[PDB]
Amino acid sequence: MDLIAPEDVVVTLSHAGYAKRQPVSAYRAQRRGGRGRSAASTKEEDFIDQLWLVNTHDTLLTFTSSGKVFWLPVHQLPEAGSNARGRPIINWIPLESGERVQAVLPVREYADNRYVFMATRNGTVKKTPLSEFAFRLARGKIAINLDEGDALVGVALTDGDRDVLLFASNGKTVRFGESTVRSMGRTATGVRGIRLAKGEEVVSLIVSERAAYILTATENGYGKRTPLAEYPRKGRGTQGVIGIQTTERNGKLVRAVLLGSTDEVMLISDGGTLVRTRGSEISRVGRNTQGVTLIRLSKGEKLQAVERLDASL
């Protein structure tokens, strides 16, 4: 039969930051897995931590530290197997000194009733219609105006129906409806999100359904899964409730992330130690808790990052 639909493509981003695309059938046929209930590596090998199934004509909407947005057409990415590494995504993102890539959002069209939701390091949020992002410029655009010393930390796509959760470094978390934040333009500063205790910052944005586990992990390698349903509505602007204890043992929160049911998680130290497990291997405890060890660190070694992979569908 004469089938005409173009095959979808898997786009991947590695932890070091190489970007690649591959026809999803070749991606599926080359899957070998094998590798166990958990794994640990000392090699500092690169590994993939982002995977999106997309149309070849789609665009990756890419957001910066400094509140800028760039457009990366998926078709520009190189085609290659699990054997070739691809190209630095920063080949498309002119970063200033110290500026970071913060979010990569696939987009097919700039529909209304879709939004970009942004969270800032100082506790500020904004909601911009996706349609404001429709016309690309090679040199980028403002996505959010930042106050001095502020940084863009989290970005997510929403349909208008989502709850948003913000997580600070002392473990404090709010949860509120996205309808609570009126739409504003790319040039706006946005509005109150979480009232931060002195010296603390926002570390993660989570977008979820109206009131699934949330993984929190801590700088000294402690953490847990707690069901979404156990995070109560806690008002925008408020100081939040305890999402995880940030006890002297634990140290500061490194990340909070919403896990899909089949997700792999990876934990990366600042000494280049890597552990991989399935999310469903991580202990489930309640929110106002210290959690359990899930990476044992040596002297002056901290958990640097927590990544998540859905390689399923």
From TrEMBL:
Keywords: ATP-binding, Cytoplasm, DNA-binding, Isomerase, Nucleotide-binding, Topoisomerase. Belongs to the type II topoisomerase GyrA/ParC subunit family. One of its GO terms (cellular component) is DNA topoisomerase type II (double strand cut, ATP-hydrolyzing) complex. Signal peptide: none annotated. This is DNA gyrase subunit A. Heterotetramer, composed of two GyrA and two GyrB chains. In the heterotetramer, GyrA contains the active site tyrosine that forms a transient covalent intermediate with DNA, while GyrB binds cofactors and catalyzes ATP hydrolysis. Few gyrases are as efficient as E.coli at forming negative supercoils. Not all organisms have 2 type II topoisomerases; in organisms with a single type II topoisomerase this enzyme also has to decatenate newly replicated chromosomes. GO terms for molecular function: ATP binding; DNA binding; DNA negative supercoiling activity. The gene is gyrA. The keyword Nucleotide-binding applies. A motif (GyrA-box) lies at residues 30-36. A type II topoisomerase that negatively supercoils closed circular double-stranded (ds) DNA in an ATP-dependent manner to modulate DNA topology and maintain chromosomes in an underwound state. Negative supercoiling favors strand separation, and DNA replication, transcription, recombination and repair, all of which involve strand separation. Also able to catalyze the interconversion of other topological isomers of dsDNA rings, including catenanes and knotted rings. Type II topoisomerases break and join 2 DNA strands simultaneously in an ATP-dependent manner. The keyword DNA-binding applies. Its main location: cytoplasm. The chain holds residues 530 to 877 of 899 of the full protein. It is found in: Cytoplasm. GO terms for biological process: DNA topological change; DNA-templated DNA replication.
